[PDB]
Design a protein around this nucleic acid. Structure first.
Ligand SMILES: [Zn+2]
Lengths: 183, 117, 74, 47, 21, 71, 188, 88, 50, 204
RNA sequence: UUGACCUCGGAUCAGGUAGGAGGACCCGCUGAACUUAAGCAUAUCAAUAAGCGGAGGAAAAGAAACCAACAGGGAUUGCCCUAGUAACGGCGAGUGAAGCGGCAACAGCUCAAAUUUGAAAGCUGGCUUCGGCCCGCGUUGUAAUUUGGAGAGGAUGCUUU
RNA sequence: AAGCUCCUUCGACGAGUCGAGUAGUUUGGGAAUGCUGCUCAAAAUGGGAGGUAAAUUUCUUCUAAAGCUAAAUACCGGCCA
């Protein structure tokens, strides 16, 4: 039941306990490096529902990302930038998925769940051997994480006509002149 | 209407017969794999949504759970004996339910099932 | 002279002050390449050299990358 | 028990960090050399 | 393969069948 | 282009690739379908000769006069 | 435009379509308002205006179409922001009993009370409601004064131009028995 | 339209997606008690205790963004006040 | 105002006398352990095979 | 002067922050823990119900395997695991609950005292997740609970429950609902008068 | 005095892994101008070229918080018409879809949310006579069961390995 | 080990995420077409999107913020023909 208790406690963020804990951690993470390793998820329920296991092969990295804009607005989020930086640091791991942890007023903070594809436990266990497959190299760079799908607009409906099934692919398909043999 | 670069985006279908032969050979290869079996799964009969097309029936995606039960075909065995199952479609009409159960009974009568190994 | 011998590409293209090759950019790990010069791309594309290993790969693929010796040998 | 000595040590270390990070400019050093100290720090003797 | 998938394939494997003309 | 030119200029042999296909185009084995399958006949023709249905779907065109395999 | 012409008014953003037409009345009580002018858009294409006296009655629904708002550069007229207008009504508005209920509410809506501290001290515009078809046409005009030839009033259109056709008048804030039905309303 | 014999469909758990879990309600109430209140909720509590209920509702709108959300927040905080009163 | 107010137990002051879950108890909580039986059987097979 | 390493400085600064910050009640009640004698009695009844080590379990399983080669009562042990113990608390199968005071992140346990109070189960807070961890054969246990004991220890468990309930829960009821922290020392208070005498005198 | 836990480090420690090339097609970031038309300005070129990052034999997308108003459809993808329609544009230059319908191919699933609690049943190593020995990971949760057109638990009788 | 059936027993579903305001960018698409940044910041007979003048906001249809998956489709480069 601890997972629902944590889910509700995370839903209530400006509550006194969560605000106090977030302040102290925000201080601790500013004292720590821009990108550093975590040990244990500070949000175990979020990590678990995103797919973190306590197996030899799963690791957490906390990354600090500067907030704001370029009046130009960057089409990729600060979440995607954090994932890409964590991947460039740990080039030997696959970025499974990232989640928010702190925000302060100058930097947002994100814990990224990463999986080692070369570990024997990961390779033998299904449900993760897909990320052992080679088509999933640098999902964070190709926009294949949750932030990437959200930014690409990969949803079904009449509100996502131009972006679902690939925006550039749709534009090309609409801008090709098809000529047949019998016209 | 040539303000864009249609020259760099133009497609010619000179491979129409080649693709046709490829498709026919693909249907031959799945028939070689699924030898006694047909190369397609059974599809239900459904009514077209729009009032423009509502007087004509067509082939749907898969058979519904309650019509499958009414015809007497188990859910876990229907995709095995070659019947498509659609858990999203709902009957809402005795007419469609009866027509689809008639279709499944015709399949039952015309089917040959081999006894496992 | 502002261009000496580059060790990576072999051309007389090494700015002595900047220490950067004007053709391949030797200090950078990546080899300099631009899509606005298809002629330069095709001058330094694969197939213009010796092909020591990539030329031998296809025969191994054709035979299935098998290891061992023919039965009844030596 | 109240971490008083540790608090003083940490405060002194942070202050030293501040003075070196400020005095690695020499304009702060000039301003420190020229500026005069106040009397509300010497207060306490008789006034 | 996962144990649940193995059980499903064991107890409901793709059968051979023919449909008459 | 440069790679092909180098191949044509060099003495290293050409690697002629056998016409391998991922999927077999004809039934094989020691069962009734394999032993009664005619490799020179088409799918519909073979299923008409067998007495079996090759497609439970709607016909997408006109069949041969003697076709009985496209229900 | 209507809010700018109404100084005794409060502008309020999107209302939930899944909410309640009497939750409108509690919202008006929240803001201490005794009249409600509600804009309800259907399909993002058609307007409907609910004029109401909250809490106890009565309330009308109009289908609103043929909109020509301000900042359309063909009106040539203006008026002070919040000045008391002259309300022009019609003999049909005094003859038909339901048009009489709609005249009273439109007076209570566009009244701009006499001593209100947000109203301008001088009068320069007339808001005219006319009934030609089975619809109500609203126009807003500036009264320009011109010296006579050896002053005279001229009118220049200043503001919104929209057509309202009545649908229902309910006894009750946003409910109760129907007192009038158009019975000739052709829905888009 | 056409005349077809109507059928009654089985209950959909996806339609039962609306949460009636008494255990989830218990968890939410306990977490409310444990965590406490946000600063804006403390302001709304102060206003509701003092009697400025229309002001509370307006501030709840200004902080949340919708009439319905403000109404639900005000009802939740009023229930918290009632529970605290009967607990004291 | 009081910046750090004491908590008023408006929910934990009341005590509930019943468990949250009404789900029935499984047989396994009353019968011996089937998994342990499997492990013992594997060990017995290993001892038989030596 | 001398320079401390970064991690040592960070953890001592965390000490100072923990002692200086005003703590919410749910963590102040974790700051309040029990004492030596009560902890010792707890671990005496508990050490009798400790889990079976892995070597002992393998040896036992081999014993019944050999017996079958050539009918037992229900085992009673200390129940551990956060989710399992929370389920036992929710189902009122737990008779006693012990919660480690030093679980980081704290959110894992921050609701456990309130849950135990609501369900009516006696609970206490123990100094040392490594010690609760040594009862089980692990490195760290966030929580341990006693569900049922043998007839030889029913009276001992009941007396331990009564003793922990009175001698800890009464003091915790006296001081658990209030905020913690505020242990300002001489240097902190002197800095406080410096700040006030620099702020409210003339200018802001 | 001793010993654990947590955190942070060292090693030419044991075993692995990343870089670069290629880039026709593919997934993202960033991003012009020439030209056309219009009192002027938005627009067009173009969500293009150049630049940067990342994969494969295909990639991507993908099993409805969908379409619809039906007598209903039923993951995704591609062709035909829809259609130069709806819509947005000084209702200029112009830009410009989708549902339906016919077809090609069709395949479904895995987790988090529950206590195995009558037994962590899970897994990495490295020592092997290859049969099993320990070190460890892990309860801040590794196996089995379940994934909301469901499911769980008891009972009940058939049917499957 | 597995499937069904029955029921005086239960039935857990993703948060700085929706959403409101705003700036930029983008689309045929201010019910903002989608996306990003910034300030505020949710619910549990809930939420999303449509239908409807029909008299109240009734009706219809799905479950977002976790993940995998062949085929039909593209190909100026690779091994060939
Ligand atoms: Zn060079």
């Amino acid at each position: 039941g601890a997972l629902k208790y944590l889910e509700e406690l995370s839903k209530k963020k400006q509550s006194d306990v969560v605000r106090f804990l977030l302040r102290v951690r925000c201080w601790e993470y500013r004292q720590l490096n821009v990108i550093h390793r975590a040990s244990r998820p500070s949000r175990p329920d979020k990590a678990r529902r995103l797919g973190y296991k306590a197996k030899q092969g799963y690791v957490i990295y906390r990354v600090r990302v500067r907030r704001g804009g370029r009046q130009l607005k960057y089409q990729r989020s600060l979440r995607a930038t954090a994932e890409e930086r964590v991947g460039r640091r740990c080039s030997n791991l696959r970025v499974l998925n990232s989640y928010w942890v702190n925000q302060d007023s100058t930097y947002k903070y994100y814990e990224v769940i990463l999986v080692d594809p070369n570990h024997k436990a990961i390779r033998r266990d299904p449900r993760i051997n897909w990320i052992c497959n080679p088509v999933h190299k640098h999902r964070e760079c190709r926009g294949l994480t949750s932030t990437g799908k959200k930014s690409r607009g990969l949803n079904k409906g009449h509100r996502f006509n131009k972006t679902r099934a690939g925006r550039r692919k749709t534009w090309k398909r609409h801008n090709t002149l098809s000529l047949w043999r019998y016209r | 209407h040539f303000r864009k670069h249609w020259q760099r985006r133009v497609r010619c279908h000179f491979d129409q017969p080649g693709k046709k032969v490829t498709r026919r050979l693909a249907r031959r290869a799945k028939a070689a794999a699924l030898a006694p079996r047909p190369v397609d799964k059974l599809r239900p009969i459904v009514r077209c949504p729009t009032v423009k097309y509502n007087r004509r029936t067509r082939l749907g995606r898969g058979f519904t759970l309650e019509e499958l039960k009414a015809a007497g075909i188990p859910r876990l065995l229907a995709p095995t004996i070659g019947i498509a199952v659609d858990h999203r479609r709902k009957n809402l009409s005795e007419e469609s339910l009866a027509a689809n159960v008639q279709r499944l009974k015709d399949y039952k009568a015309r089917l040959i099932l081999f006894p496992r190994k | 002279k502002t261009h000496g011998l580059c060790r990576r590409c072999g051309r007389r293209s090494l700015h002595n002050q900047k220490k950067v090759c004007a053709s391949c950019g030797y200090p950078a790990a990546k080899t300099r390449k631009y899509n606005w010069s298809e002629k330069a791309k095709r001058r330094k594309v694969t197939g213009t050299g010796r092909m020591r290993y990539l030329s031998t790969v296809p025969r191994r693929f054709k035979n299935g990358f098998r290891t061992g010796v023919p039965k009844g040998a030596r | 028990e109240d971490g008083d000595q540790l608090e003083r040590e940490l405060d002194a270390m942070y202050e030293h960090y501040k003075e070196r990070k400020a005095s690695q400019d020499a304009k702060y050093r000039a301003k420190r050399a020229r500026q005069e100290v106040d009397d509300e720090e010497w207060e306490g003797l008789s006034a | 393969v996962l144990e649940k998938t193995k059980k499903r394939l064991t107890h409901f494997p793709q059968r051979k069948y023919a449909v008459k003309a | 282009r440069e790679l092909q030119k180098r191949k044509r200029r060099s003495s290293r042999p050409t690697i002629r690739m056998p016409n391998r296909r991922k999927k077999a185009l004809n039934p094989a084995g020691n069962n009734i379908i394999a032993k009664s399958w005619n490799k020179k006949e088409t799918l519909s023709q073979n299923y008409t000769r067998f007495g079996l249905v090759a497609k439970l779907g709607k016909a997408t065109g006109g069949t041969a006069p003697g076709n009985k395999a496209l229900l | 435009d209507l809010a700018s012409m109404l100084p005794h008014g409060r502008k309020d953003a999107k209302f939930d379509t899944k909410s309640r037409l009497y939750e409108l009345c509690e919202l008006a009580e929240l803001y201490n308002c005794n009249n409600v002018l509600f804009f309800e858009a259907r399909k993002g294409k058609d307007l409907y205006m609910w004029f109401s006296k909250v809490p106890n009655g009565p309330t009308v629904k109009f289908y609103a179409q043929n909109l020509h708002t301000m900042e359309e550069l063909h009106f040539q007229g203006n008026c002070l922001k919040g000045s008391r207008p002259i309300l022009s009504f019609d003999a049909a508005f005094e003859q038909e009993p339901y048009l009489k209920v709609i005249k009273e509410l439109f007076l209570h809506t566009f009244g701009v009370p006499q001593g209100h501290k947000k109203s301008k001290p001088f009068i320069d515009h007339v808001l005219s409601f006319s009934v030609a078809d089975g619809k109500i046409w609203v126009r807003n005009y500036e009264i320009r004064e011109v010296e006579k030839v050896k002053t005279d009033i001229n009118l220049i259109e200043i503001g919104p131009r929209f057509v309202l056709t009545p649908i229902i008048i309910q006894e009750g804030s946003f409910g109760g028995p129907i007192l009038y039905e158009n019975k000739r309303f052709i829905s888009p | 339209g056409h005349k077809t014999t109507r059928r009654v469909l089985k209950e959909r758990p996806s339609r039962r997606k609306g949460a009636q879990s008494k255990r989830t309600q218990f968890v939410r109430s306990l977490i409310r008690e444990v965590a406490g209140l946000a600063p804006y909720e403390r302001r709304v509590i102060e206003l509701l205790r003092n009697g400025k209920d229309k002001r509370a509702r307006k501030f709840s709108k200004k902080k949340l963004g919708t009439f319905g959300r403000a109404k639900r927040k005000c009802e939740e905080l009023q229930r918290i006040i009632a529970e605290s009163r009967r607990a004291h | 105002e009081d910046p750090y107010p004491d908590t008023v137990e408006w929910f934990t002051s009341v005590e509930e006398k019943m468990p949250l879950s009404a789900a029935p108890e499984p047989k396994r909580r009353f019968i011996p352990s089937k998994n342990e039986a499997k492990q013992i059987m594997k060990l017995v097979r290993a001892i038989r095979e030596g | 002067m001398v320079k401390w390493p970064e991690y040592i400085r960070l953890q001592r600064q965390k000490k100072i922050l923990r002692m200086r910050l005003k703590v919410p009640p749910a963590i102040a009640q974790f700051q309040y823990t029990l004492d030596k004698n009560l902890a010792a009695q707890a671990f005496k009844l508990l050490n009798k119900y400790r889990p079976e080590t892995k070597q002992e379990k393998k040896e036992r399983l081999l014993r019944e395997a050999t017996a079958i080669k050539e009918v037992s009562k229900k085992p009673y042990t200390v129940k551990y695991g956060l989710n399992h113990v929370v389920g036992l608390i929710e189902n009122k199968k737990a008779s006693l609950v012990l919660i480690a005071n030093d679980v980081d992140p704290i959110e894992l346990v921050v609701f456990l005292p309130a849950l135990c109070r609501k369900m009516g189960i006696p609970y206490a807070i123990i100094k040392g997740k490594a010690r609760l961890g040594t009862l089980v054969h692990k490195k760290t246990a966030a929580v341990v609970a006693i569900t049922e004991v043998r007839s030889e220890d029913k009276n001992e468990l009941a007396k331990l429950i009564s003793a922990v309930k009175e001698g800890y829960l009464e003091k915790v009821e006296d001081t658990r609902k209030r905020w913690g922290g505020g242990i300002m020392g001489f240097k902190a208070q002197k800095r406080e008068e410096k700040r006030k005498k620099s702020l409210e005198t003339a200018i802001k």
